[PDB]
Amino acid sequence: EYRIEHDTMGEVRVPKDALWRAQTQRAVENFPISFRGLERTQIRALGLLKAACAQVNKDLGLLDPEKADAIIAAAGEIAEGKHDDQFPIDVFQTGSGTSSNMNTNEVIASIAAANGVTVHPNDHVNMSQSSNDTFPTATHIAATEAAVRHLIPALEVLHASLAAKAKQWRTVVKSGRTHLMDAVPVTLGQEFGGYARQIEAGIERVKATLPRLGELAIGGTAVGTGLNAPEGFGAKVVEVLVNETGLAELRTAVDSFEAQAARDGLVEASGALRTIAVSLTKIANDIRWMGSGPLTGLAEIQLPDLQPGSSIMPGKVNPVLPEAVTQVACQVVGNDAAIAFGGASGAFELNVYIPMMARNLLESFTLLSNVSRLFAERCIDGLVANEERLRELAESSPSIVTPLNSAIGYEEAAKVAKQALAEKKTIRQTVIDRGLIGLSLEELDRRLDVLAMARVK
Amino acid sequence: EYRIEHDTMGEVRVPKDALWRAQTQRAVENFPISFRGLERTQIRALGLLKAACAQVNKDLGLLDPEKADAIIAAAGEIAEGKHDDQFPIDVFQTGSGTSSNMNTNEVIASIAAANGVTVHPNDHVNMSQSSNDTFPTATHIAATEAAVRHLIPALEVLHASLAAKAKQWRTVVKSGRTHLMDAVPVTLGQEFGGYARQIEAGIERVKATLPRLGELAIGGTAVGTGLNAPEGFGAKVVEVLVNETGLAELRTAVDSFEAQAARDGLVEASGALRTIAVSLTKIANDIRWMGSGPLTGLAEIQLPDLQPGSSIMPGKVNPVLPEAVTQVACQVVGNDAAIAFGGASGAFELNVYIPMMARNLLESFTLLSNVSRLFAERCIDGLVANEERLRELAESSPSIVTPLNSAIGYEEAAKVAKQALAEKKTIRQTVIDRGLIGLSLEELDRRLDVLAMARVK
Amino acid sequence: EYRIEHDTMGEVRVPKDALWRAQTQRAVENFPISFRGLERTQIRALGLLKAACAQVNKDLGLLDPEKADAIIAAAGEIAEGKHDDQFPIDVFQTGSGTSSNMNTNEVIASIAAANGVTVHPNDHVNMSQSSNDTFPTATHIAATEAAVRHLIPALEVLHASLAAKAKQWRTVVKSGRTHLMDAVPVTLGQEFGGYARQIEAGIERVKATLPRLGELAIGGTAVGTGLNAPEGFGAKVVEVLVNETGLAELRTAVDSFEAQAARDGLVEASGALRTIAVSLTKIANDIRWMGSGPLTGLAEIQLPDLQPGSSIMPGKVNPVLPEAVTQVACQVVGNDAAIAFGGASGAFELNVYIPMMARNLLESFTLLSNVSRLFAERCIDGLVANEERLRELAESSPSIVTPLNSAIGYEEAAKVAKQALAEKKTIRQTVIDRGLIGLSLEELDRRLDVLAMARVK
Amino acid sequence: EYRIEHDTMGEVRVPKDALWRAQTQRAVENFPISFRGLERTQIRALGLLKAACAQVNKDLGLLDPEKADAIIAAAGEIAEGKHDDQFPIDVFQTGSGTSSNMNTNEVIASIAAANGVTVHPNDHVNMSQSSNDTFPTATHIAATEAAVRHLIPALEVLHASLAAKAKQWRTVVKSGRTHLMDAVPVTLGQEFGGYARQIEAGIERVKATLPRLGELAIGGTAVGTGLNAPEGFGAKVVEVLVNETGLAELRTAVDSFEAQAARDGLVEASGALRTIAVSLTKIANDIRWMGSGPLTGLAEIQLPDLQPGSSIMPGKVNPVLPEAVTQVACQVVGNDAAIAFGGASGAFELNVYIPMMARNLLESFTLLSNVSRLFAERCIDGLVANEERLRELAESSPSIVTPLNSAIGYEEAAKVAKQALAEKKTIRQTVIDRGLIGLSLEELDRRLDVLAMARVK
């Protein structure tokens, strides 16, 4: 069942109970491509943004208080998520986000109409605005909130979890591995201290993007000039947004043309997430390798069991969380390539890849925030080390000859390693058999202590 | 409200009215990452696959007909899409798809239980199977159906639409452009014939991947050896699948270890789609450029109006379909990088990136199928050429001097072009003024006819 | 020391002994970016191409035989590699390859001048041509020769080497691994048969691209119309090229506009190489993992020693060839993303990313051809299996309980696996202790034979 | 002609006059893959690094002053580039850089031998070191010097050039374009101010990576523990390096395991360069579009002529510098994907993709530094604007109706735009004809002034 609405292009049938109107409905028919629309956090940002602009228009005497207040209230319902099903437009819409901007304007208009107030989607709800500043503004608010409120806290949990293991396993000695081959000793704690640093550096990486990710185009209107917006509109809206969200990271664009002609801050932000994905692949890979076996692998640690491993092989349990982490990392990398391709494809006063860039960036924030916390809590926290096996692994490496270098030289040392392996004997035995002692017996032992070799801080 | 179920790891609370059971529910708790589960076409493939395996197990006397028939019927309900909301597991699950495989087994078990029949998710519904052959099998069935039944037909519509314009605009002469600068004449029809060829070559590209995309692991069970599956199980299941789906492209794997240790056919298939995305970016870019203006751009053609252009600038209309196409192309490129990263990350007997690879590949098929048809029908078909403007564009290029090369030589020709531009005069005038005629007057004209210059077939 | 030359833009100083002239020298000054110029195979292709065009121009009476013959001879010296140091222009030149085309024309002119014959770089050496058909033509000849004469033979060596191991290790039983965890048995030969299939499929993949990679633009001249080229020039040049090179894969473009407006065949070809890189990462990773240790890893095989492992740790030797292979695979993936970005960026009658696309594609052919042969000969051929260790690995996996499923059911089977691991006892012992026999004693043994479990063909 | 050398693996023939020795020569035979070796800046870094380590070993009494001083002198010759042809090892070597590390040690040994001093490549030249800390150290020194001394200054020139045009063209009014369609007015200067900001933000982006790019592994030796290196060796070497190079950005690693197990700082650094490539594609694209024509394009500006455009079309000149910039941007994007793939592929105590990551990152620094300066000086500086054409473009856009919105409302405004285009009349005429005046005659004019519309600061 339908009603008639119109826009400047003509009449359109709209579902009778839909709060959207003509232009939203055209976009429904124009872009049935993915059948996925804006995310919760994007719809929220649009709501907050519309509320903020209405407030400033009210403050400056440009918009009737009754209309402003109903727009602010309607926008608030949208921001709170009462109307997400009134946002049916595909991600793959016109690249400025015009359609979703109008979708927000029209839904506000219909909510306000239901509360006794007549507001025009363009003339009132979109007063002093364009899609060309509002859609990227909403995108950067969403991205900034995602970075500050979701990803960074999630990474901090993961960091804490890894650092707790770095401390716990401080003196848990094991064989280092380089090139996958037997190396000199390290501690399990040292390795986890490395993983913790990768995550801490990741936090630094996301933070370093915030000064430019938090820039908002708001106020630049159609092409960056601010035509049809009053003086200092952008700064005024940003102040309301900072006041309402608590996100001090939000700010006016340094250059209002760069802020609309490009989405360079989104490409920058994705680069930090892609680096985090690179770090997480290494961390997760190492952990599932340490967990491998129980009998045909490394069996250095035990990961917590999360579910039955195999529909066919009874009793098997698999490192499912590292698998989720590594698959997420692939998605972030894919998403990152999509973001950059769109970023490079701007023209003159507007980059028209915003919805695709937003979808991909926001998804990477989400996947990384959610999988980092799960990895920390359902995997890292419950890892159990096989301490005795690990100490044997350390004492078995041939490369425990390495600290004898300064006393016998690299070349004689290598002769000890090749002879010890062909005999199935120890490094201590091959050197004492080689007649090298005389380098004392007491000195050979001190240098061959594996935990001393790891050089624990 | 909940009930108790168990698996080999213990007891799990499951929603009372959920048709899934213990293992699905663990996966719900283990992988809340993206909150997007399997697509319609993946759930379908799993249903068909389970029906087919049950039939073969019935045929070989290994599975009680009453149990087989209830599994076949239950699987059929799943295949038809009656139970998509009983598949809540995240894409970012264990990388073999164990969880979704078990999700299918458990939902079938609960449907059959409701019809008076007791079938064990492992012992019966998963008889002769592993996730390690079934999940990639379902993925390759979905991908192959997507290629054959959706993308290729969509591309054929787009091809027809472009070729119709190649014919329509056969003698519509215009200035060619190289490096974005004035070149010798072409016809609008020639350009569209190029775009049509890119799409035809795209069809060829997808087709060329089908011999390996259509390979199915079915029968290789846990590691590729076929343990716990009867002799020729895979060939038998493939026959049922070919019979039921009509997809002759489906086939047994050439090597049953390669078919599980890798997903190389998915990377191959994505390469063809990425090439199509590269082609579509060029086609769409050209079309929006030809459509640019109306007064400050090229204004060669007019694209059909699809919606009001701008919330702020009245009357403006934008090339929204080319924007959808180019954004889709970015997504396909991103998806393609994700697919390849997962593809490269296999280990020993199993690549455990299947759900992420499947999600990305299937999405690229979908986005490309849907946007290609929209582009054909809502853009290409209604394009209107500005024939008189185009003929003036052709006759204005300085490079119409080019066919005089053989008569006056490259160097004197260049002297004609530089003098004609500094005077604001024609090529004919600059050559006759330059005293070159005597090369006759009649010959200069014949060579300067622009439509003859385009060399129409 | 310098001489004066000119072109249509004016006078340029050129080194006195340089065979290039004005336009090459401008490009030297215009593009000092990478300081790497065209590859041997590109210079060759340009030489052959110029010889072929001169021959056809001779055949058709359009070019004086004395001038044609000196151009053919000069071009032949270039093709043979006598003048590579006369090609100093950067890869990062004008995107049509104009500069390298002119570089070839000018060097031919100067060689011919030294043999008593005066040929104009444009009017004679470039007769019936543009850079816009010749540079992509030379690029596709180079790419096709690389595929047919270098990569495919190299892959065939690698395929043979892997298949020889598949045969050699047919009955060398070992534990399969899925998710990195203990699985049911396979043979080392089965795994290598998988790797061999990945390489055979790679061969198929490159072959499948040849019908479109081998398309040549030759004849389309400036914009694809063939202006200033005689009728059937392209077909005539292609015939000479096929006659001279033996490459039957070379052919005229299906559509002469698509063949210049895009380089879609180069993106297609790169997709096949990227798939090969994905396959090689898996193969190489597995091999270095099987080689890992000697004491802290898997120690399944021994790779041939190629050089001392470590400047610091005496005696260590590392899998350096797998490292070369995996790093090459990264480069191919990078190169592939560069190729596609350029491919998508065409405009109207010409894609002007050709030199960058050519550089990247040709490098991927080279790296893959060279590393595949080295990997085959210096690694794969000399691999030695640790047969006794491998048979113990197979017999230790808990998942050897799997073939008891049909007799005792998945759930009781899992109870056997969990009890056997907590006891440090065998599967046979845990089932006989569990009172399951009575499933006979003779049947338990037959099902527990590990080589029978691998299901060798 | 050859001599015999040996290493711990045995005897190797080495060219008689080569300064390298056994291990370098094995690497020559082991890795003939790309036939491109280390860059000038990498060889330099290795030289400086070896000099610095020798100095510290001297300072601590661990290395004989005569041997140290000859190593410092030899290393200095290498650093200065006297011996680049003594570094023949392929980029695609063992992924730790062992071979190039040994190549440096052996060349120093042979130089010192020629000066009367016998130093052992391992025992002396490599004293207190591993490849595992030295090769990444040299890589990060090279990358940091490239960022600080080459790229940032090059970007500052480009920034100055763009900002000079932003100032010059402050009041040069033109039509804005969004979606490629006619928009409201901007100034050419505003657009260039946007491009300048993208470059300034790029500078910020590279700077933001320096705190982690400048971290050096030096001191962590084999696995990060510092075994066989004295206490505070790393800090001591870093101090010498900072003293010698002036690069205060160089620093000790925050965590010595993260600094060898990963190359996350290289992926981070590449992300900043990839963002710069995205920005440069937009800037260059816009500029070649503004330059397009002269008769069939936008013809907004004139780029400086750099070389004859076309071998075939006389007189044509093409935007060759924007083409070089956009092709470089593709290469940086490709390189960036290669870097990240290698970065993600670390294992335990060592990421063994260093040479490939270094090659790609250093090339991106180089291409971007060189093309940015060329673009600034040979393109941007000499751009000439077509001021009268531009003012007509501004006054022709239909969207000059936009500032009437607040007076007549969006819907009536759109009626003015559609009627003005169908009539071929002006906005002023269509509104006065529409009877809207009465909104006064004087007010319509003030709002329709195009330079006032651009809102110049």
| Alpha helical stretches, state H, A303-353 | 320-343
Flag if C228 and D326 touch (Cβ within 8 Å). Answer: no
- Taking each continuous run of H as one helix and of E as one strand, the counts in chain B are 17, 8
Instruction: Report the b/e string of C136-149 with b at 16+ CB within 10 A.
Output: bbbbbbbbbbbbbb
Q: Which of 126-185 (B) contact A at CB < 8 A?
A: 126, 129-132
- Taking each continuous run of H as one helix and of E as one strand, the counts in chain D are 17, 8
When CB atoms are compared, the residue of B305, B313, B328 closest to A33 is: B328
Distances (CA, A) of D360 to A83, C335, D87, D100: 48, 10, 18, 17
C-alpha D129: how far from chain center: 30
Tokens of A215: 């820039």
User: Cβ contacts of residue C448 below 8 Å, gap of 6+?
Assistant: C400, C403, C427, C428
Flag if C316 and A182 touch (Cβ within 8 Å). Answer: yes
* CB of A350 closer than 8 Å to CB of A132: yes
Q: Which of 220-279 (D) contact C at CB < 8 A?
A: 221-222, 228
Residues annotated within a binding site of C: 96-98, 120-123, 130-132, 178, 311, 316-318
3-state secondary structure of C250: coil
C-alpha A23: how far from chain center: 33
Distances (CA, A) of A408 to A455, B430, C405, D125: 21, 89, 59, 16
When CB atoms are compared, the residue of A92, A306, A371 closest to B371 is: A92
Tokens of C430: 């845990």
Cα D270 from Cα A113, distance rounded (Å): 52
* CB of D242 closer than 8 Å to CB of D250: yes
Whether the upstream peptide bond of residue D308 has omega within 30° of 0, thus cis, is no
Tokens of B287: 């079309």
Interface test with C, best of A295, A300, A320 (most C CBs within 10 A): A295
* Nearest CA among B214, B194, B196, B205 for reference residue B259: B214
Cα B440 from Cα B446, distance rounded (Å): 10
Residue that is written with structure tokens 């790029």 in the block: D202
Cβ-based contacts of B285 with chain C (< 8 Å)? 346-347
* Nearest CA among A131, B316, A349 for reference residue D176: A349
| Alpha helical stretches, state H, D115-229 | 131-145, 152-168, 188-213
3-state secondary structure of D10: strand
When CB atoms are compared, the residue of D98, D311, D352 closest to C311 is: D98
Q: What is the largest CA-CA distance in chain A?
A: 102
When CB atoms are compared, the residue of B268, B282, B348 closest to C177 is: B348
Cα C374 from Cα C328, distance rounded (Å): 12
User: Cβ contacts of residue D176 below 8 Å, gap of 6+?
Assistant: A222, A223, A224, A225, A348, A349, D183, D184, D185, D186, D397
Flag if D179 and B416 touch (Cβ within 8 Å). Answer: no
Cβ-based contacts of C198 with chain B (< 8 Å)? 258, 262, 264
Residue that is written with structure tokens 């429904």 in the block: A28
Domains with residue ranges and CATH for chain A: 3-129 (1.10.275.10), 130-399 (1.20.200.10), 400-453 (1.10.40.30)
Which H or E element spans position B270? helix B264-290
Strand partners, C215: C251
| Residue type at position B373 | R
Evaluated on CA atoms B273, B278, B279, B285, the torsion sign reads positive
Flag if A393 and C296 touch (Cβ within 8 Å). Answer: yes
Tokens of D452: 């006032």
* Nearest CA among B264, A375, D331, D31 for reference residue C345: D331
* Nearest CA among D35, D53, D65 for reference residue D101: D53
| Residue in chain B nearest A36 by alpha carbon | B36
Cα C375 from Cα C368, distance rounded (Å): 10
User: Cβ contacts of residue B37 below 8 Å, gap of 6+?
Assistant: B87, B88, B89, B90, B91
Cα C254 from Cα A195, distance rounded (Å): 54
Distances (CA, A) of A244 to A239, B299, D94, D319: 9, 46, 55, 49
Strand partners, C174: C186
After which residues, if any, is chain C broken (C to N > 2.5 Å)? 438
D1 interface with A at CB cutoff 8 Å: no
User: Cβ contacts of residue C141 below 8 Å, gap of 6+?
Assistant: C45, C48, C49, C216, C241, C245, C247, C250
* Nearest CA among A213, A216, A212 for reference residue A252: A216
Cβ-based contacts of A293 with chain C (< 8 Å)? 181-182
- Residue B119: phi and psi, rounded to 5, are -125, 135
Cα C136 from Cα C140, distance rounded (Å): 6
- Residue C4: phi and psi, rounded to 5, are -95, 130
Cα D289 from Cα D309, distance rounded (Å): 16
Cα B152 from Cα B249, distance rounded (Å): 14
Strand partners, C384: C302
Pairing of strands A2-7, B173-178: unpaired
3-state secondary structure of B17: coil
A198 interface with B at CB cutoff 8 Å: no
User: Cβ contacts of residue A29 below 8 Å, gap of 6+?
Assistant: none
* Nearest CA among C257, C131, B422 for reference residue D308: C131
Cα B298 from Cα B293, distance rounded (Å): 6
Q: How many CA atoms lie within 13 A of C177 on its CB side?
A: 26
Tokens of A450: 């594996």
**Given 3-state DSSP classes, what are the helix, strand and coil percentages for chain B, each rounded to the nearest 5?**
65, 10, 30
Cβ-based contacts of C331 with chain B (< 8 Å)? none
For chains B and C, CB pairs below 8 A equal 275
Strand partners, C11: C6
| Distance of residue D312 Cα from the nearest chain A Cα, in angstroms | 30
Strand partners, D174: D186
- Taking each continuous run of H as one helix and of E as one strand, the counts in chain C are 17, 8
Q: Residue B456 class from Cβ within 10 Å (0-12 exposed, 13-18 middle, 19+ buried)? A: middle
Cα C416 from Cα C431, distance rounded (Å): 6
Strand partners, D252: D216
Strand partners, B186: B174
* CB of D257 closer than 8 Å to CB of D346: no
Cα A121 from Cα B229, distance rounded (Å): 64
* Nearest CA among A314, A7, A299 for reference residue B123: A314
- Is residue C83 among the annotated active site residues? no
Cα C36 from Cα D343, distance rounded (Å): 26
DSSP states along C140-169: HHHHHHIIIIIIHHHHHHHHHHHHHHHHHT
* CB of B128 closer than 8 Å to CB of B201: no
Instruction: Report the b/e string of B69-105 with b at 16+ CB within 10 A.
Output: bbbbbbbbbbbeeebeebbbbbbbbbbbbbbbbbbbb
Pairing of strands A301-302, A251-252: unpaired
Cα A131 from Cα A122, distance rounded (Å): 11
Resolution of the experimental model in angstroms, please?
2.2
Q: Which of 339-398 (D) contact C at CB < 8 A?
A: 339, 341-342, 345, 352-353, 355-356, 360, 363, 366-367, 370-371, 374, 378
3-state secondary structure of D96: coil
**Which residues of A are the active-site residues?**
179, 310
Backbone Cα Rg of chain B:
30
